[PDB]
Amino acid sequence: LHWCINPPSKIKVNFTNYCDTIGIRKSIASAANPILLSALSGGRGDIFPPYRCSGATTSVGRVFPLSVSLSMSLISRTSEIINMLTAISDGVYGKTYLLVPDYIEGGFDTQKIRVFEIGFIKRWLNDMPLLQTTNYMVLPENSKAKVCTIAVGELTLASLCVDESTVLLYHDSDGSQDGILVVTLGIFGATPMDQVEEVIPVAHPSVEKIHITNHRGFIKDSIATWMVPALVSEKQEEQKNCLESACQRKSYPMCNQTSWEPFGGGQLPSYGRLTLPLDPSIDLQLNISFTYGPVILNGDGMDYYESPLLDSGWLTIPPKNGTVLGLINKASRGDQFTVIPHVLTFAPRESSGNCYLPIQTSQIMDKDVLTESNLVVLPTQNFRYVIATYDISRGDHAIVYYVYDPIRAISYTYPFRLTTKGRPDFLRIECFVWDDDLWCHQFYRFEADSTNSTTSVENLVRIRFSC
Amino acid sequence: FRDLHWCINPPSKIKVNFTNYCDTIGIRKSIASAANPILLSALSGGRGDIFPPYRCSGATTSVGRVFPLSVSLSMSLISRTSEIINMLTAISDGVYGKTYLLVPDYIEGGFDTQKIRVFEIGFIKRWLNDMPLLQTTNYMVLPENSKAKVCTIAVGELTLASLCVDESTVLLYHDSDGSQDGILVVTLGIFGATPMDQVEEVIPVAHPSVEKIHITNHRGFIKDSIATWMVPALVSEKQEEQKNCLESACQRKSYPMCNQTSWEPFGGGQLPSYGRLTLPLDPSIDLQLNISFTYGPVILNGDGMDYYESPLLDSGWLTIPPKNGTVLGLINKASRGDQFTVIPHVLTFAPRESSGNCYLPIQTSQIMDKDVLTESNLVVLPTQNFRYVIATYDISRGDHAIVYYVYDPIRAISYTYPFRLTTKGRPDFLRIECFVWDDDLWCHQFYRFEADSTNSTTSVENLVRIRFSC
Amino acid sequence: RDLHWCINPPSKIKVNFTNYCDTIGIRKSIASAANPILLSALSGGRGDIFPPYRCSGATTSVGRVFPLSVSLSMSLISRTSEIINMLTAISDGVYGKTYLLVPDYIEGGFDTQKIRVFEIGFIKRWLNDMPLLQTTNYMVLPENSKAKVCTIAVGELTLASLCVDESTVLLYHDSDGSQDGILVVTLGIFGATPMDQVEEVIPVAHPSVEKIHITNHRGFIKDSIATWMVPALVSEKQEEQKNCLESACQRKSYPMCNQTSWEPFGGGQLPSYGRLTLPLDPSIDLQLNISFTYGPVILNGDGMDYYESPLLDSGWLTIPPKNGTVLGLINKASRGDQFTVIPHVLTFAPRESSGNCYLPIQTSQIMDKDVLTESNLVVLPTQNFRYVIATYDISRGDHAIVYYVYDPIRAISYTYPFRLTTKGRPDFLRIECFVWDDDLWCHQFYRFEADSTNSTTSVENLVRIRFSC
Amino acid sequence: EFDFRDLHWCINPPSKIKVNFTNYCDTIGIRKSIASAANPILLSALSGGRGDIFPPYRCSGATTSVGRVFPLSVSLSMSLISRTSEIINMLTAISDGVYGKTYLLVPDYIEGGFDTQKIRVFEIGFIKRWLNDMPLLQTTNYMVLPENSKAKVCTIAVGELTLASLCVDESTVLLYHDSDGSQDGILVVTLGIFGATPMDQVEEVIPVAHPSVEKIHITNHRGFIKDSIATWMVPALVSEKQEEQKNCLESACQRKSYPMCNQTSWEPFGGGQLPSYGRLTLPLDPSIDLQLNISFTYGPVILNGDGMDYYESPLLDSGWLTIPPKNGTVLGLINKASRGDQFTVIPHVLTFAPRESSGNCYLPIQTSQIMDKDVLTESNLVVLPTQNFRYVIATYDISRGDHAIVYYVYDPIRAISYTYPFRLTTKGRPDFLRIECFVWDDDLWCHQFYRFEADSTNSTTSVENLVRIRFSC
Secondary structure (H helix, E strand, O other): OEEEEOOOOOOOOOHHHHHHHHHHHHHHHHHHHHHHHHHHHHHOOOOOOOOOOOOOOEEEEEEEOOOEOHHHHHHHOOOEEEEEEEEEEOOEEEEEEEEEOOOOOOOOOOOOEEEEEEEEEEEOOOOOEEEEEEEEEEOOOOOOOOEOOEEEEOOEEEEEEEOOOEEEOOHHHOOOOOEEEEEEEEOOOOOOOEEEEEEOOOOOOOOOEEEOOOEEOEEEOOEEEEEEEEEOOOOHHHHHHHHHHHHOOOOHHHHHOOOOOOOOOOOOEEEEEEEEEOOOOOOOOOEEEEEOOOOOOOOOOEEOOOOOOOOEEEOOOOOEOOEOOOOOOEEEOOOOOOEEOOOOOEOOOOOOOOOOEOOEOOOOOOOOOOOEOOOEEOOOOOOOEEEEEEEOOOOOOEEEEEEOOOOOOOOOOOOOOOOOOOOOOEEEEEEEEOOOOEEEEEEEEOOOOOOOOOOEEEEEEEEEEEO | OOOOOOEEOOOOOOOOOHHHOOOOOOHHHHHHHHHHHHHHHHHHHHHOOOOOOOOOOOOOEEEEEEEOOOEOHHHHHHHOOOEEEEEEEOOEOOEEEEEEEEEOOOOOOOOOOOOEEEEEEEEEEEEOOOEEEEEOOEEEEOOOOHHHOEOOEEEOOOEEEEEEEOOOEEEOOOOOOOOOOOEEEEEEEOOOOOOOOEEEEOOOOOOOOEEEEEOOOOEEEEOOOEEEEOOEEEEOOOOHHHHHHHHHHHOOOOHHHHHOOOOOOOOOOOOOEEOOEEEEOOOOOOOOOEEOOEOOOOOOOOOOOEEEEOOOOOEEEEEEOOEOOOEOOEEOOEEOOOOOOEOOOEOEEOOOOOOOOOOEEOEOOOOOOOOOOOOOOOEEOOOOOOOEEEEEEOOOOOOOOEEEEEEOOOOEEEEEEOOOOOOOOEEEEEEEEEEEOOOOEEEEEEEEEEOOOOOOEEEEEEEEEEEEEO | OEOOOOOOOOOOOOOOOOOOOOOOOHHHHHHHHHHHHHHHHHHHHHOOOOOOOOOOOOOEEEEEEEOOOOOHHHHHHHOOOOEEEEEEOOEOOEEEEEEEEOOOOOOOOOOOOOEEEEEEEEOEEOOOOOEEOOOOEEEEEOOOOOOOEOOEEEEOOEEEEEEEOOOOEEOOOOOOOOOOOEEEEEEEOOOOOOOEOOOEOOOOOOOOOOEEOOOOEEEEEEOOEEEOOEEEEOOHHHHHHHHHHHHHHOOOOHHHHHOOOOOOOOOOOOOEEEEEEEEOOOOOOOOOEEEEEOOOOOOOOOOEEOOEOOOOOEEOOEEOOOOOOOOOEEEOEEOOOOOOOOEEEOOEOOOOOOOOOOEOOOOOOOOOOOOOOEOOOEEOOOOOOOEEEEEEOOOOOOOOEEEEEEOOOOOEEEEEOOOOOOOOOOOOOEOOEEEOOOOEEEEEEEEOOOOOOOOOOEEEEEEEEEEEO | OOOOOOOOEEEOOOHHHHHOHHHHHHHHHHHHHHHHHHHHHHHHHHHHHHOOOOOOOOOOOOOEEEEEEOOOOEOHHHHHHHOOOOEEOOOOEEEOOEEEEEEEEOOOOOOOOOOOOOEEEEEEEEEEEOOOOOEEEEEEEEEEOOOOOOOOEEOEEEOOOEEEEEEEOOOEEEOOHHHOOOOOOEEEEEEEOOOOOOOEEEEEOOOOOOOOOOEEEOOOOEOEEEOOEEEEEEEEEOOOOHHHHHHHHHHOOOOOOHHHHHOOOOOOOOOOOOOEEEEEEEEOOOOOOOOOEEEEEOOOOOOOOOOEEOOOOOOOOEEOOEEOOOOOOOOOEEEEEEOOOOOOEEEEEOOEOOOOOOOOOOEOOOOOOOOOOOOOEEOOOEOOOOOOOOEEEEEEOOOOOOOOEEEEEEOOOOEEEEEOOOOOOOOEEEEEEEEEEEEOOOOEEEEEEEEEEEOOOOEEEEEEEEEEEEEEO
């Protein structure tokens, strides 16, 4: 009777190859660490104004049109870039977008290609960020890359690509179960860059579906976490009781609806955490989880930002036309998935308090389009969240940023030169703190009267709050 | 089949971490191993084919087009109407490097603030439809230094080298006589903060006959961890043979050459000789910048001399760009290693009934034209067949086009680029750097022209591909 | 249970099996390595003490001398090197010695230098079931300033000492400048961290205490706390003792009130017992504690031992007899928190007294003319109470040493007709007895006098007294 | 096809670890802690003894030898000797600040009948300074073997805070011949510097490398312990030595060394063949059980079977094998041998290859006229652990006017001698003699043991002391 030590799977297949991968990854991390330190030293300081000197502050905005990224180079050549998701964390950045090759003109819409890219953030002699792409990957056309999620961190990029918006977790068990094409990117061309369509293990038999439309997570401690709506058969009774308790109020249309947004009809969606352990030791496995929480009214997107706490992260939900406000519920990254409605969840009247609701109105909202973007939780000790909108009230089309603080609320618009006729069908902002400032990377698309082509415009903007 | 025996799980006291059992890999080795697939994806395309297999139609034409897509930093800066001056690019084995002087316009102080030297290096990735996409993976901006005004680019083996100096003519005298000129040395890795140097260096003069060194704009390469440049130098030992050869050639029709009392590179005295700056990039060894001079064919330009790799073991093709059209270019053959010899190969005229040790450059005033011509450098392609490319800016065409003159030892093929849209403007500085890609000719070009405003010079840089089909 | 099969791992997989468990501390490892010796001593010796049955009822004493020992002091004596004042403290299977070593290789005047040595070692059986005092560690103190007197306290594989140059510590009278200090010395069984010598500045528990009289004392190290017993001078207790002194003065016991000044402190008042305590912790607060207490009057403060008692937190206390007084004094004492002393035996309670006073028995006519240098009272380590004192006798023609093993019921004696040395007169005779395999083993030591004034020979040798029915 | 998830890699632990890992590494921790505790003493001893190995260059003339005795010691052997108890066959070994002794003890203090038995005693200890810059041999541990005393003859090896000694009842150990009945076993005795755990006493069978080795001779073999391995050298019996040794003997026989050929039988083994070099290694590690593998290699002839002393060499894997001279022969042997690899003995010193011969064989020198007809007894040669190669021998003779003992401190240039007239017993017959030397405080310290028989009363008296030789310009 000898002593067997159990090694992780995929290390016993080729220990030498595993350890060559380990050494290459460690060397790449060591080589790229000085750039990360140089970029993060200024950013990690603070965001709050130190001294209150003039009371009410002023807003100064500047557009920085210089970058080394592949996306802006493609856009500069009038190439259709649609559905771009960008994530900025740990000093690195990532992008996934659908590219339409206009170099050769054949037909009108033949195929759309998906491009990933992960790069650095660097100074440009004026203490300004310079987004530089150090790697990219282009998927083959015959793949399920229509809808993917972005999650960048620890010098790595990960994604969950699926052709259909709604993944059939358990209903399609009898047939060919839907797979999620996991796409992983390193910061330098090497083995970490791999893609594999893998069957996703359910949390329980209770979980039935998964909705993946436009999501964002992060990577920390070699884990990849996303938050997507799910469909379970146990949250239904308590959520129905809470919804009926809220229905007696003036919020009649909420309970008047017979079919919910993320999944047609049926029951309410439930929060769902997709966990992807990203380590070279073991193989890839999408560990889905779920947990009942506040009522979810829209399933367009569900981001997941990092928090200064130990094992918790904010869970934002972009506002939808009809629901004036979006949830910023807290989420647990640990072994047990818990969702606590930290802020922006209206607790109902005459209720036990175990269930929360968002705030919606029927006629309060502006009849203008006023397209809003996903709200972003800034990485800093103080809690601030930024949401951009496509303002229309002024004579010139504009984008308005709301950095929420309990003390004051002032927003002024400087003239935006680029376009005066705007039909925004998409808008996403990704913000980060750089030298005690708010640098937001915004992307949006248009629709023109000529209808010859749709122009997608993206740039970096900095808002300076001067005392 | 032979299993040792059935086993029992040992007590949980022992925890085994499998990461500690094997050894770690160095940063340079890991970086090279990572970058190897990207280098191979371009080397295979380059080495797939060189020339058409058979003359399908009995005659070959030329098809050319521009490729505006690029994810380089210089293209991004140009897109933001930022002024870029004197960019030298050295494409080699799927790695490129650039050295340019930036003139910031967002900074507003006085009228002229400062010019900053920028270095960048990166791969040549396969874009869709099998196109060359120049990607930048690392770059470096020098803090304000006097010695970064003129630099030489030398790219190869996943690293960059540069020899920046302040004055055009670097003086090489014993000890320090008054003010001394030093040669700044720059180095860049392909990624991250790897062992790299930005150290000012004092030249080991080697043979003390070298007195000056001229560095206008030179290209070299890094082979076997050795960076080699070729620059004119001024020696005062052996000038009688060249003087006798010039006197013998003066009686011929080559009157203007023998009429010069003072030459172009170094004022007065003896004509320049051929030098060679050698920089061993072995990180264990301290940096030394050796110099190996050797006389050769007479130099008539001296304002720029590139140096390209050769298929032979220790050979190269140092080139001299044409000067004002009247003097044509030269393509010599320079040795590498401890010895250094120069053997005239192409575009060289051997005088009749001469000493035999002097070869002279072809020089005809008939080629000179009132048409404003800005000839570029001679670019030797990295192919087995010896072919060199010439790019000329001419206004004879109504489109204010740029003409490429691809030359062969057998034939000569010329292709024009009427794609030029801006007609107004006189070019000031045109450079090209060609490379082979999927059995095709790609030539990265950069040129600046001054418009009618007398204060605006637009730096235009783009890739052009010329295809010759049977 | 059986975990299926194996496969040969790659050659890069080699494990040392060594980095994978705890690191044992120095003191814990030393205690683990030394425990079997302490077991072989304690279980072998302390199992049987007294004759189990009355049998005849009249016992005889047969004795024998065992000169073999690996002790360093024995070897030094064998090389004719003078040792002046040695205190040995045997407890729990370990021994320790402190003695003035006088190098006589080169001599000048009276004494060129005397240099202290502290040694601690085990007690081993030597294939005849006899004790072999092996020396395992020792430390030497150069005679810089403090090498005059010390106290010995051996226990828990550790030695302790309180060395002061002055005969009596001037604890409070020197507080104007720098008060006097006591060179604390600590040894371990094997050379390690506990071995330290850190002189400590004294916080005093009582403002009344002012003198400490360190001459020759023995203590023990119990529960990592080294405690001794030293007489101390206080003025308050004399107020209570004065009534008893006046009552005894008018009584027939004239020699009690005849005394006007005491040896330990000239003039002054009646000294009181002071429990010196040194909590031995390797990390924090190596400081002393002095807690005076009332008790029986001290006729002689020359020496005061401190033997462990079989009670919960109690300890014995002895005072060796002095010439002029016929008896010593044994009184109980408790360690921990408050300090109280209640006389156990050998104290006479005067009649018609308030009760807060006790007097040892003294007779001025029983004493014989010949000079007898008695040794300290020693309490044997057993449940019973047997105290043994060795007396040097000159009346007998063999110049024998007589071991008076005193018990309150039956008193027994034995004489050692050995080492005549008629010209020799003892100067310092000390013993340290212990029970070993149902026998009384004593470790005597003495020094002779010279008629030629040039011959001083320390004589250290273990002796055993056997009682059988 | 084995499924890899259920399949496991298995490692092979040592036998002692597998049975009780907890106990094994508890012993490992205790040993490491004791070694760390004892390290300061060894460091102080090494610091005191390293400096000034040799005096400077000659100032006026030849250096003068100064002798001094030091009877003070805290060893058990000295205390036993001082009590008029005889000590027989003591093998002292001093190395790296720790010494060790194995001596037969004759109990006479308590006598029952006529005689009970002789007792083996194993004693380890420390070398400590005694405020006068001379060593103090202090015994920190000792072991007394039981009354049966299977150990009549034992070796000695000390190093790395350990004592090890192979013990055999008979001088000759028959590895193969006595396998028909009960195979001869060697009693391995080890003991740590302090405590109660480290001691082991086990009788184990010898796994010799090849059957070619049939016998060994274990009488007096000082070794040492380095890298947790204890090494000894004993004569060995092999069958393949004759083909070269007899040829060499006949090739060098025509010289003056006729009696060497004239001997029909050799002293270590009656008849048979010439003795061969042998090496015993004891891996002293808690993880691995005790095994004793005997190697062998070829070398110069072994003139006497008294015993071969193995010493530590400054080189990486070298050892100054040493053989004492026998009566008649004036010069012994100081060879060179390797440790840890295949056994190989090169005859560095005391061998002169005969001229006009093959040259592949080496022979020592002999001269019968030197010893004359007086009772002169010489001891073993001690290789000092210094940078410069040295060797010391001690001779006890009556030819000296004071019946003294002469110490021939040998030097590559000349030889120096000192006499100890402290011998006040003219009627002295040395039955046994042995010296062990070490360097301490820029002097030469030697520990001698001369068991001499007093003919005045016909009673043997064992005498041992510590003597130091000082060389001053």
